[model samples]
Target chain A: DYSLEIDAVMKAAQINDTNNFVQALMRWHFSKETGSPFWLGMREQLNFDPIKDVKTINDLRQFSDISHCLRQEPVANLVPQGLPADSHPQVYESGGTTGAPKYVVAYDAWIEALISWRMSGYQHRPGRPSGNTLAAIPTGPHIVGAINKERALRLGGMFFSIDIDPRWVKRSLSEGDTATVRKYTHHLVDQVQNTLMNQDIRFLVTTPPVLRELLKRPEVVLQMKQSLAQITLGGTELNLDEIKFIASEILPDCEFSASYGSTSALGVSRSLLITSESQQVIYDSFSPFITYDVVDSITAQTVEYGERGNVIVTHLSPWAFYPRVAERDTAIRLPGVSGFAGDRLADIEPLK
Target chain B: DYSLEIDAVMKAAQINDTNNFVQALMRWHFSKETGSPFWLGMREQLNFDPIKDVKTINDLRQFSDISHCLRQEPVANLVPQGLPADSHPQVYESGGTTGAPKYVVAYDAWIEALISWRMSGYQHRPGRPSGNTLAAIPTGPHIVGAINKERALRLGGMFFSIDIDPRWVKRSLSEGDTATVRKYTHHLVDQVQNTLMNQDIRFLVTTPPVLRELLKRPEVVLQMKQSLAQITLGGTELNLDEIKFIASEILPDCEFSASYGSTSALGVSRSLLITSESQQVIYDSFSPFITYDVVDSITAQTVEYGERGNVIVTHLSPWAFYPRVAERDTAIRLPGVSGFAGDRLADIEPLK
Candidate 1:
């Protein structure tokens, strides 16, 4: 079913002329003849003719000026005017890390794209026999928490989560309020520790930073290592050395994996199913729909295999426009192994 | 103070070798030589010879594989072994949207960096006579809600927020459960409407998607516009055309602005301080600490100023490792006309 959806989107992208497709999409969604009210208001000032230009996936650069559009505004306007009036649309907000979060409107088509991508995670991984997961993540203003819960539900598992406020921690850190930050961290950790001690969490999903902290506490470690069978970590990079350490010392018995992705991409990079011990943390992005390329930092050119560069990603789906996005991460290209098409990255790190 | 801190970070990036700095930082806070138990345990397997490599910001690429480190461990291992026994470190989780959330450990240095960024928002815009801000965002597990409240306190204003779970709505949408999404949205709007009708809300902060639904209900819009003099929207993008519409139709009299940023960057991009009647959302990124570059998506080259391209951001702060990150959104490079470095793209649409 997921593959069917992916096949449909890919076929749509492949069949249509990129520029004409984009233009037709905008005109149908935003034009007066077929556009929705959201797009009609801006028909006059669309500087670049999306209908005329935007031919290939590469042409998305011509319409790159939408970032300002996300600063603040009405979500209704994000809806393409072209959808049928009866079409049910879902609106989502970006994490308000910067200030005002940006909005994205999703129709069934978009949701399908994401769902298809998500199903890919199930491809190589072993099925959860127990079907219970323990999640320690922020629940509000985030789509992931729900998605993860849904994944667990689909797999016939119960999902449990602990409350956390990353923005608070970040804000506190930004302000140099060490006292508050420490207090907040302890408060959040206490909640998680309590849950882990009480619950029978088999599948654990969390952040690398949080996992690092959890490992420091002996009680939590003993409980997690004992109870948790399979763990999936995302949100931030978990370097090669760290992975090796984790494999050897920390959760050596648990089935450990890492996912790399963003809200815009609508899917996370699944861990290589048959991974070598040496290639534990390295992630290969979603093939075709989501592809990863590394570029030279200064020149912005694709780095050769085994060379270090910034990550350049392309997500081709029907739901949204996330083609050829260069991520903030730096990685060295690894040779393609198994079912993966491109070479994967060895190590990843955040820039200054 | 913010400027001084920025300068210090910039100086650190330039003068100190990244690897040595990381080691020194760890030694100063976590090593046996000058370290704490935290670092001694956490840094046991740092891949690179931190003392040898990691000289510049770019050298961070050497450890690009750090994502695995955060995936499945206890949060405590993230702390530096060199920190003093008294050093209070805070643990935070990423907004879990993709799969599992990643974690980050914050100490005094990281906390100060974020706080400095927040302080800059105030210094940049001393809002008209400093009015009380009423925020409507999620509280539990969300950092923004508390941080905004703190910001309100710092700015000498009262802050108010309504609890919301975007994950629920996202789940509703993902599962094609339109009724639940509607119910959730209505519930959120009802809270805001009640507050605006009863309380003297001088400023408003909320996600754009939430605002759109709120505006659709005539009663909510009438009361919000009448009571709130300044509306600051975040967590979503308001396209240029939508900005024009909101300025003219929705909240005509309110002082409207947009902000673009993320939690990883640990700062907000302030809207340009200009009194232009055009209603184009011109967002300026934080210079030095947070910088933006619009590059041609295909060519991987910087686009001409005013041309659309993918957004490449850089945050040079001590709190986090996010130095140069390519963002998911796309924008045009608006040359420095205002005090800001780059002008963000206004009519943002996701790349499909």
Candidate 2:
């Protein structure tokens, strides 16, 4: 039997009190009857009690970065017992951008909620792409591909994906195989070019690096200007000037925005759509479920609004619980959106 | 806004009379109020009246192959007018093994029904792997990737996909770039090897050619022997000797089977479980909706049981109407399964 309260709390509408939801999440995930074997085993070794000490979302930091354990833990052991024994949670892995890939399980309810949050970013926006989507992103184990696929399904568009192996790119770059990297990057752009020329693609989802290479081709630029309605960029961050160049000079006819977050968080943050050329690029998470904090990497002290620091991701959900993951990126802290908890991110970049 | 009778006929259970379903299909697709722009436009060109003359599924042959038109026709023109304009159907493309890819649209009802029919092939079987599935198949534009993804979601398992570009393989071979072909093949196998060695993957989905190369490696063979529970093969067909050698020797502990169908069909046929070493491999379609007619290449006459001929695929549903698509493969005609409408297929192979 499934827990009704936990199910209700999982809904975006039902989450009224942030602390109450956090407390309930702690109760559900750490409870003897509902806790996962991974967390339950951790409870025996931890210095403090999770269910007792974790009062609000901010207290989630008390738990150390336990994501490394995910690489070795049996995925079956990660499911909460409260979920039906037959409820097979979908498994997704991190891009392994930082280190070895870490695994996580996601129930459909949480995923559906994430999609609703993700879609709300673009659904009612002016000149949003309603046509089919062409996404050249990391597929296979990565969560971004799965989320985009589900998003396309809901929008009633065919998701044309260009499979990217981020691991291959990282490994090639590490070994200084610049020639091979160039060849592989060209190969990726060629597929994009072929699809763009042949298909009536209105929405494009890809990384900043690939998009840079894609725009280098003048023919594709003309095609995109004629057909593309929106461009959603992810995988890596871009500075304001680069975003401005692409939006103003190249794809002036299209709407473009950059997104943030990681697979460890189980969902991505929505980018504040770029409208005026002068507007700042900002990203907001799904709030209580997935929140972000900007802190000084050395002292672990919170950064003030408009101050630059390391981005810390906290994911607290019935399907997954990853807390205080110090991400590799740095961003400026901004005031949290009205009615939303945590902070918004701006000018996000890889940590120096 | 949707047709109740067409929805009912789409169900696997409600389809009691095959001809009645076919009649309803014609009436729904060719009717002025319900017909697609493409079909309504098509009706103006046809010499014979479709609603008056097409009485049975067999009469589908009267329609010539219009698949090439799919490469050019606007996808919007393909949707039936009776289906709510808001009902955005998903678009899938053929692998383009024969020529340029042909596009098709699918609604959730048809896809759910297809998944149910696809799952039935192995759901009740003994020793079926309940653990996560790792598939090495073509993704992006292909339908198999989408179907397998949906299948894994329903089974509550994570689908670890190793992306394959079949076009690259075909083009490389044609241009005699065997070195690049070998390198690409090795790249695919390496991903599978890595995932198998590190992850607890029980179910494996790949092609016969890849499996042949994979079995050559001792480390992978040993790992697969130790952990793999079921192997589902697709992409290209294999002869009995090949299937037997792999099943009986390399993976004796694991169950293995092959599937047949096309992206143009919008669904795949289910493989008859290979219980005994000597049992013949046969593929059965979700008949009345998707059917196979093995016929002579020149005369266009249906082949008798045990006779080999070209495969003609027919897809008829409220969502899509692709009739008499002469596929690139050939197979021997076998008796249709007890309740299925169309003829069964055995020893499927690409037209040589």
Model 1 misplaced regions, further than 4 Å: A1-55, A81-88, A107-116, A121-128, A273-276, A286-293, A312-316, A322-327, A333-346, B1-223, B227-352
Worst 10 residues of 1 chain B by lDDT: B22-31
Instruction: Considering the two chains of model 1, state its CAPRI-style docking category.
Output: incorrect
TM-score of chain A of 1: 0.76
Q: Which pairs of residues collide in candidate 2?
A: none
lDDT of 2 by residue, B6-52 (tens): 66666533544787788888888888888788998988878887888
Candidate 1 lDDT over residue span B1-352, tens digit each: 1334334444654353343344444234333543334335545566655445544434433433344444454555544443445444543444544354555445545444445554565545645445456677654434454356555645444455544654444434765766556655665676566556544567788767777877788777777677666666674456556656786676777766665545445456656532336555666654444556677778757688767787766543333344345567776577744323334554343443
Over A169-254, each residue of candidate 2 has an lDDT whose tens digit, in order, gives 67557857776577667767876776687778888888777888888888998999898878888855566678777777878888
Candidate 1 Cα RMSD after full superposition onto the native fold (Å): 25.3
By TM-score, the best candidate is 2
Candidate that would win on DockQ: 2
Worst 10 residues of 2 chain A by lDDT: A8-17
